[PDB]
XYZ file of N, CA and C in Angstrom:
60
model
N -8.269 9.979 26.363
C -8.452 8.569 26.627
C -7.147 7.813 26.485
N -7.230 6.731 25.760
C -6.080 5.870 25.520
C -4.956 6.647 24.805
N -5.318 7.597 23.944
C -4.326 8.386 23.213
C -3.242 8.967 24.137
N -3.322 8.718 25.433
C -2.313 9.244 26.337
C -0.999 8.502 26.117
N -1.103 7.297 25.568
C 0.073 6.475 25.294
C 0.914 7.096 24.181
N 0.333 8.064 23.478
C 1.016 8.750 22.384
C 1.767 9.959 22.919
N 1.318 10.445 24.063
C 1.939 11.596 24.693
C 3.265 11.190 25.323
N 3.424 9.890 25.543
C 4.641 9.363 26.139
C 5.808 9.448 25.163
N 5.507 9.412 23.868
C 6.564 9.484 22.869
C 5.987 9.634 21.466
N 5.370 10.751 21.186
C 4.766 11.018 19.846
C 5.740 10.666 18.717
N 5.269 10.750 17.477
C 6.121 10.437 16.333
C 7.318 11.378 16.289
N 7.313 12.379 17.161
C 8.414 13.334 17.191
C 9.728 12.608 17.473
N 9.809 11.938 18.616
C 11.025 11.213 18.974
C 11.450 10.284 17.845
N 10.479 9.843 17.053
C 10.757 8.953 15.935
C 11.318 9.765 14.774
N 10.577 10.776 14.348
C 11.031 11.611 13.249
C 12.352 12.285 13.610
N 12.553 12.539 14.899
C 13.783 13.184 15.340
C 14.983 12.339 14.938
N 14.982 11.075 15.337
C 16.096 10.197 15.009
C 16.056 9.777 13.526
N 14.897 9.353 13.027
C 14.805 8.943 11.628
C 15.346 10.039 10.726
N 14.787 11.229 10.889
C 15.201 12.376 10.093
C 16.504 12.959 10.636
N 17.032 12.336 11.686
C 18.276 12.798 12.293
C 19.459 12.532 11.364
């Protein structure tokens, strides 16, 4: 459903830079 908006940029891209 709507959760497709999460597939566009999961917390991965976030944790990637944050934890980068």
